[model samples]
Target: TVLLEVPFSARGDRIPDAVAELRTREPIRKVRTITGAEAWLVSSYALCTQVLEDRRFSMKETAAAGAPRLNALTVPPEVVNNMGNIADAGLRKAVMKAITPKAPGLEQFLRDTANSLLDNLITEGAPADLRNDFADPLATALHCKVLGIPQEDGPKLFRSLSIAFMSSADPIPAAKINWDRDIEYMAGILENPNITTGLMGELSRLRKDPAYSHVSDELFATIGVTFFGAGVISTGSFLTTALISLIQRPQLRNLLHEKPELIPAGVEELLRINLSFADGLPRLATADIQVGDVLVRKGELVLVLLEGANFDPEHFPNPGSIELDRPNPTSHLAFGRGQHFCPGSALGRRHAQIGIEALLKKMPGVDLAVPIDQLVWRTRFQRRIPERLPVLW
Candidate 1:
């Protein structure tokens, strides 16, 4: 089985021909990774959904051994895999508490907070690198507020956000060093009242409860850091695409900015249409599994391509084009599926909705400084993101 090279190049968002061919002929086939490992590439719409919902596929890092892995590991497996327990239980309580609507004052807080950031972007004026100045900064601020980090600290923590995604040579050494440095810095200030006033405070209190007593402040801090790091990259990338989609198209921008009613629906449409793959969920086959005609043996590696799954035509009619009015737009796997579902899903939608609104409303008549075709993309392990989004108003 020939391994189909992914993205082909760091040129555009176009889906590879191999993906289309797999979706048509053999949705489940063996392909070699760039690292020269063999794994099943599941591309069929139905098969991808089946794989996602099946509990037999495990996300635990223990599953990575002898499997066709995508990237090198840089941190402990517990920090990465001990994400949520059966039924999610209390494993993610701190993160869930911060991002959910149940978080008090969220709506009012976002409305007021976003205005200030948008004002900054507007005040900074035109011919700006929207990715760096606006989307990345705004996203960092949002994650910091949720994680109980000071808004001022958002910029310092921004560099560590990419440790998980950076493709530099021997990234593990640098990633671990950076990870340790931030953890140590966070550890130093754990006793400070001013800093512990937000989710960090909430996470601390949970540990005192008999139910959550097994979790230590150290573990809680690590989780908060994970959320802090992961959230920045994930939200920042999607935010970049959302702005690109709207700024590049005037009619779409006008509809979202003016209609207001459709903004909620429009954000979901954007999530579906966006093929940006920030991460691919990898799972080990617990037992023999049949993905169509292919039988994935026990311990085999399976990579669920969200980019491939979301574009599946059976679930999404004419999957290639963006349909703002598409009836079944909510079915996208952008936020993922089943037990591993993102705790930050609602907040992400809120980010897209409020953030896009601010940009379109404040930066009236914004245009891409470069032609759309000339824009650049960078391919990292399991993720392809815009290098930078530039715009003029």
Candidate 2:
């Protein structure tokens, strides 16, 4: 059997045609990852959901020593299990509470931030690069507030993400260097008396509590660093791609702008079809399991293509078209399913909804400044995003 190279494309504007062909013909088949390791690529909506819902296919185990890798680890091996580690340390609720979109004043802060960013772009005139001038900075500010760190610290942390989230075939030396450097910054936040507001502040208190004395300082600091890094990149990249989707559809954009109430439903459809994840979500099978036509053996790697499931014609009728009235709008695997379902799902949704709402109101005429092909898409990265989203309003 011939093995196809995984990650068919990194383009954020459109899904590659090969995805549909593979989903139709093979569904679950062999593919080669960037690390030159052969793995099973699961593309059908049903099989992707099955792999995600099954515990035998484990996210943490993907970090197991000598496992066939999709990409080299960007952080310390232990950090891959960040969520489980927080739960073990009794910090999950606190962390969740801190990142909630509904947290008191968070929605206001998001609205305020979005408006401010747009205001700056408006003042500067059209042809603004939304990725840098708008989307990224908004995500950075939100993460900074959620982490309870000084807003001034956001830029330094944001700078680390370019290296921090690289999906390189081999381990990146700079990744480790930035990880340690950011960890030190988080450690300092814990010690700062003024850091008493966001997630880091809650963690700072937990660090000193007698009951939590057994928790390692390394884990505490790691939480602050990883949360900041992951949240910023995830939200920023997602919003950037989502903007492209919305901007490309002028009718959809105007409809949402005219009827703000429809924005939530519109956002859900956007999430369903959004091609933000550049590569498939990887899970290491701990036990032999049957997926589609293949009997994936124990210790094998499985890649769940989000767009495959999101755009699967059988599961989502007219999958490529954005229909807000779909019966199961929220069922897409844009955020993975089961045990590791994104904890920040609510916050991510709200960020985009608010950002889009602000953008549409501020610049309802927003459209691409150049031809789609001229845009530079970042490759070999965790998320699919254009290097700059140049837009005219």
Candidate 3:
């Protein structure tokens, strides 16, 4: 039995070295989960990436067959269907229209939105929670504007959707209830004649086209839910983690402030080190596949620990340390590799970069207002996040 004893307070820093040790000894080893569930931990980068890319491991199948669920929250089948099914098709079309290179004025709009939020934060004064004050609002605002969700409803929707998804309390029924409500809310917006062009408008246009007319209302609503959920929670968490990392490492922060051109490099370094999501990608083996010496049986659950993979010495030299000018930094699996790689990866990076730059530029002397130990970090969910990151200039 694998003795997987993970604590609520456990951080990614505690696991990378152990994963390296295991990879050095036995790359693909059977490890007992903290929950005492038998799991296969793939520590090597090559095998990890292979598993991620290989068609033999399927997320759709796992979701359909009810493979071992890692969390208590029950994601609606539509949510899963939208993610594993309609998303790849609809998102590719709708998202491109909403945020592509040729999208008129989208980039400037995002930058303006970011700056406005930063201005609000600055005006609110120091010793404020970055997560609550800046990160959450910025994420909410961007997602709302792009998705055509009313600005006034953004915060309430964000809170409702977040609690419905993240909280451990009876996730299935709660998610379904909230999902239904959110769908109605978004549908009402779509039905309104006053609704203007946006991502949803693009979806509506696609729905009118015979070529893509099959796009259903539920699927469109799912896209909206995903945008809001990811925008508020995931983006907020990413910003917070990046801020925490910079606060801890002031010299590195100074470098970023001094050479703004290196912001991209700095963001990469931040993603590589911070394992934002603990759930990782869940895949099930379709057939008996040889992973190292072990033959993973068909229908078995496999979790690719991205944090562990990022820190694997085979792929990244000095994996634990942040190297600003590290060559070939794009290889980092912060955005999961293969067909399932996050479509919002570029948007996410831009948000983090802009948010961090604004903070550093506006609040020059900002630092942690409390001891690192006293600062509460989010542990209930998979994402590595600080619950309330108080900062003062």
The candidate with the higher TM-score, 2 or 3, is: 2
Which digits, one per residue and each the tens of the lDDT, describe model 3 over residues 249-357?
8888888889988998999899887767755566778899988778999877677777768888778898878898787798988888996787677777887887888
The order of the candidates by TM-score, greatest first, is: 2, 1, 3
Full-model lDDT for every candidate: 0.71, 0.92, 0.71
Stronger candidate by TM-score (1 vs 2): 2
lDDT computed for candidate 2: 0.92
Pairs of residues at least 3 apart in sequence or in different chains that clash in candidate 2 = none
Inter-residue clash pairs, candidate 3: 2-32, 4-33, 4-34, 5-34
Q: Which residue runs does candidate 1 get wrong by more than 4 Å?
A: 7-12, 61-64, 85-91, 167-171
As for TM-score, the candidate ahead, 1 or 3, is 1
RMSD of 1: 2.5
